Amino acid sequence: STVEQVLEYVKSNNVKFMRFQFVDILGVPKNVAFPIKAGEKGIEELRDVLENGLYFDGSSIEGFVGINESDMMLKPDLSTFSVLPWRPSEKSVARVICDVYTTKGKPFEGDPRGCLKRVMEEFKKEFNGEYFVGPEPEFFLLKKDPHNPHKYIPADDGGYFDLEPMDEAPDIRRDIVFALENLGFHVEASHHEVAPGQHEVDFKFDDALKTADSVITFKTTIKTIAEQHGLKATFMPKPFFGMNGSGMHCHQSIWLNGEPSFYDENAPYQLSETCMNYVAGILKHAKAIVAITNPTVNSYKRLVPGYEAPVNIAWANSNRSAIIRVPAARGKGTRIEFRAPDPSCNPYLAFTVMLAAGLDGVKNKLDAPEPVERNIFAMSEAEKKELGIESVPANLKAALDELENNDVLKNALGKHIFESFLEIKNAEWDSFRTSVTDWETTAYLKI
Amino acid sequence: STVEQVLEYVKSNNVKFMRFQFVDILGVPKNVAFPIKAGEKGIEELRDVLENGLYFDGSSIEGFVGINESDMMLKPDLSTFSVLPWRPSEKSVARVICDVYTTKGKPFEGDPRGCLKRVMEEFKKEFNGEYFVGPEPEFFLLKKDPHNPHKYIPADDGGYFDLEPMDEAPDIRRDIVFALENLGFHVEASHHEVAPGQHEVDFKFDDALKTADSVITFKTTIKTIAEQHGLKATFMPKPFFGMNGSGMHCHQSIWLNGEPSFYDENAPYQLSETCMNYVAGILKHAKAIVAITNPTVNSYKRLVPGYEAPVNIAWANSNRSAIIRVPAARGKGTRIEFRAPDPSCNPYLAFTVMLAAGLDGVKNKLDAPEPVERNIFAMSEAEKKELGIESVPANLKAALDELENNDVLKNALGKHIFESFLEIKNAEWDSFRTSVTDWETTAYLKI
Amino acid sequence: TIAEQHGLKATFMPKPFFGMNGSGMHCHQSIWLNGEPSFYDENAPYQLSETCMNYVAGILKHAKAIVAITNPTVNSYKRLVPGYEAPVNIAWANSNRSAIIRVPAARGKGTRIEFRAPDPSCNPYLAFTVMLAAGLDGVKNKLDAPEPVERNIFAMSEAEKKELGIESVPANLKAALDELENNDVLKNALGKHIFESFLEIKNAEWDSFRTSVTDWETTAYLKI
Ligand SMILES: Nc1ncnc2c1ncn2[C@@H]1O[C@H](COP(=O)(O)OP(=O)(O)OP(=O)(O)O)[C@@H](O)[C@H]1O
Ligand SMILES: Nc1ncnc2c1ncn2[C@@H]1O[C@H](COP(=O)(O)OP(=O)(O)OP(=O)(O)O)[C@@H](O)[C@H]1O
Ligand SMILES: O=C(O)CCC(=O)C(=O)O
Ligand SMILES: O=C(O)CCC(=O)C(=O)O
Ligand SMILES: [Mg+2]
């Protein structure tokens, strides 16, 4: 939208506050609220901030700048304008997502959003291509343990596609869908997921930048709506041992010159050569991609080699036992599902590395291996070794070491994001590996 | 006629009470309520009190007069007229900020407000200058510890620029902004600050006297609105060990003959000679300025030499590790940020000493040192010693001893305020230094 | 250990409770040369020898630095607190408990000086070292002791003490460490290793105290 359209909506819908939003290196949303004054004076002041942006302290944001070079700017992207449904209707609250700039008026090298914009701009200039993503960020709804109020348990005992009363969340999922529609999402479906208290609310795919903006907005919405219902929502990959973790499978496709390039009516599986080259790129860099798409210690309690998880580096058709599933849908619906990611990732960075890795396959015309039509979880380790089916790294540190040795992902992320992420995550790993866990006390106090 | 405008507002908006307000030497607001009677008789009784003022006992106000010379007067400044938003709408409550006078009709020498008026009047008479200040008084929102209802803890676990639900204060910050707008403030921005439960609500800079009035009104507004939400707000500089303290950074600039004299398009850093002379004055008197801008024992738990704090007596551009930061903004936005102050200061006295010190630099054309573009917190003590970077005093008593030996600040404050402040603060220091603290019981009971 | 056996806890903390006396460790001391009580002199004023006066003069000269060692905690300066009734006034007196040194009435082999500033948080080996090295600085150089103060020093005004030359010991641990750091007699007595380790340990202890947020501050300032 244009500055005029934004001011006009604010003017006629009594918007009182404008959130200027962005994300830190870990994908945590950040914002400052600008109060809109009454009259022409207020609209002119808003026009100035919307066009010229505002300053903030970059040294108080994770992965940004140091204290001695800390002044930074936010430049609003006006096409991201939305009204917050959870906030009041009278004297309402709108938001605008921003790109981080330096004081010199240049895009910040450490901005995750600008990082995704730049790889998308390069993809459009080099191939006239568009990168489309449909992510499915699952979550748990939690309530306090009646036996210990300091602990959280799943909000119900339901399972996949269950009906009420076993599924206790229709009212919560209902309000979430209404909120996402008011924020401009095209919601597709909602249902109880496999684990107790786990849920899914699907929204239509879009270009990687809009989709990344929606993943950030989506997580805030589920969390604030769950609070309104006296519950707590979590996007933690594996909150509970013994039940499913939450993934964020990323359905993705590239469209060259406005066409669904992954579809080929006369090819095997009706999948194009470009689709196979892209799949080959993702499988080649899968071990390093997971440092970014699965960036927490807990991510590897769901993405756990040796078990039933999206860890096996192979692709397959309508088969949920490989790291890539190719859904049965064809035509414009032809796409690949990268199953490894979880909702703890920074979507801007996750989409950057998946595109960079897939385009490494397209640019070099890499050969994809044969699909694996068997249940990979039913194969023995030696049978997978013979077939060449490798696994992703088994923990955060092993994934960071893969990322550190991947030139394609280092170039896509750029020096600043790449080195800050490795530094932050190495300190996070050090904190975990030096702690004394409850598992250890249970296992070893008796010795 | 300003009085005619006040009386007409009262007549037509059903105003029932008029608070006559002022501050004691420590900046604590004080007021007496006058009930407005109906009709022309009531309006003339109110006219008489607005014009002629009213009496009070100055011996019951800290830093004022003794019991044997205790009758004093309050002379309303009618440009301060405002309606209290927290008070009822029907039969509303208005306020007027007053200047303290003696029974002989003379401005009281011990009045902090008159003290700032007088230095500003002298600055306008001598240079045709205006003194503009933009302060940022941070605060914590507190709730009772569920484990001990006698103790207070931060109201949430959020951090800098966090969004809800982690940031739990959008409703409180919203009501604060509305209350400040109703009080005539030009609010600029609001957001969660670095520490858990900490927040910031910025308002536009103005002349030092209006800004000092606004700081007093701002702190009452924050505190009353927080109480309405079942929380407690504190402007204590360092309420909790291990997390950020609350500062009140003072952005300031002097405008000679209506122009932003700190801006110089053709000078290094685009900062004028006057700006450099002013910075040199603040740096010269910084050790004594902090007795007034950081006047509590607790102020030196945030302003603590040897740690990451605004203690290093140096200036820098877009660098938050020095006692003065010069923001990147230029033109009319050209200003210096004195980072040492905290919201426990009396803004009338704080603005007086900062202007007096800056003008000592302007009047004598003092040379400012070179800016320090490095992170001062990364330098060793010997490296700072070589560069001539000194630190502010380490505690209240050390700061009082600096103030006692500063003729520029003693003359700006005047004998009465200066001697009363030193006497009160020496008794406050004596109280602290003779107490047995919890730190000591933990450290030494075992010996 | 005996208090624990009675179900109680004993503490040698200098000032555990505000509003009541602290615990001191007054050190009565005397030097005997060639087996004789050299502090006693039957025919001298107060029956105190010249050696006794030289020793008292040495302790009073170094009192400001001695307290870094004899009063080595933050809490020591809540008992040893200048401006109040405490053994802070650098003067000596006979049978008078308002000075830093009291000379008890006993004479003969009982002739000695009572250094009242120390508290039981000190390392006695280091406390006795600095007191002896300061007293012997007075003996070796035959320093002149000031006149005794027979008045109640707590009843004097600050200006009256300033005129009489009655100074106070440092007001806190850090001020005492800074006095010790500038005293060559005590640095030589302790030696480089003990001296530098003590200053390093105590500066970290001071930093810990000065960065903490105390209960006094919460009570005083949470309401602002
Ligand atoms: N051509 C495409 N490119 C990228 N994403 C697409 C495309 N077509 C659909 N999607 C997106 O794929 C996501 C998953 O859709 P959908 O749930 O219908 O498939 P699915 O096989 O049922 O996956 P799952 O079983 O994991 O839920 C949706 O966000 C959808 O918008
Ligand atoms: N020329 C000026 N003179 C004095 N004050 C000014 C001037 N221009 C702006 N200010 C004030 O300075 C204050 C700082 O506002 P602002 O937050 O925009 O700057 P900032 O450098 O980002 O501060 P911070 O990052 O510490 O919050 C505001 O109160 C503003 O009104
Ligand atoms: O339950 C859902 O998933 C969506 C909402 C709904 O169907 C309902 O309101 O019953
Ligand atoms: O949250 C703030 O800082 C101001 C209030 C606001 O933005 C809101 O109502 O959501
Ligand atoms: Mg689905």
Author numbering:
A (entry chain E), B (entry chain G): 2 to 448
C (entry chain L): 225 to 448
From the paper:
The complex with 2OG/Mg2+ was obtained with and without ATP (MtGS-2OG/Mg2+/ATP, MtGS-2OG/Mg2+) in a new crystalline form and both were refined to 2.15 Å and 2.91 Å resolution, respectively. Since the 2OG/Mg2+/ATP complex is at a higher resolution, this structure was preferred for deeper structural analyses. The allosteric 2OG binding site, ~15 Å distant from the catalytic cleft, is localized at the interface between the C-terminal domain and the adjacent N-terminal domain. 2OG is coordinated via ionic bonds by Arg20´, Arg88´, Arg174, Arg175 and a hydrogen bond via Ser191 (primed numbers indicate the adjacent unit). Phe18ʹ stabilizes the 2OG via stacking with its phenyl ring. 2OG presence at the interface of monomers reorients the bulky side chain of Phe18’, and remodels salt bridge networks in its surrounding. Consequently, the N-terminal domain is pushed away from the neighboring C-terminal domain, and the α-helix 6 and β-hairpin 9-10 (residues 167-206, in the vicinity of the active site) are shifted. In the MtGS-2OG/Mg2+/ATP structure, the ATP is located in a similar position compared to bacterial homologs. Strikingly, in the 2OG-bound state of MtGS, the 318-325 and Asp50´-loops adopt a position similar to all described active transition states in bacterial homologs. This suggests that the binding of 2OG triggers conformational changes leading to a catalytically competent conformation and explaining the 2OG dependency for activity.
Glutamine synthetases (GS) catalyze the ATP-dependent ammonium assimilation, the initial step of nitrogen acquisition that must be under tight control to fit cellular needs. The dodecamer is organized as two stacked hexameric rings, and each polypeptide is organized into two parts, a shorter N-terminal domain (β-Grasp fold) and the remaining C-terminal domain. The active sites are located at the interface of the N- and C- terminal domains of the adjacent subunit in the hexameric ring. Two loops in the active center are critical for catalysis: the Glu-flap, involved in shielding the active site during catalysis and deprotonating the intermediate product, and the Asp-50’ loop, which binds and deprotonates ammonium.
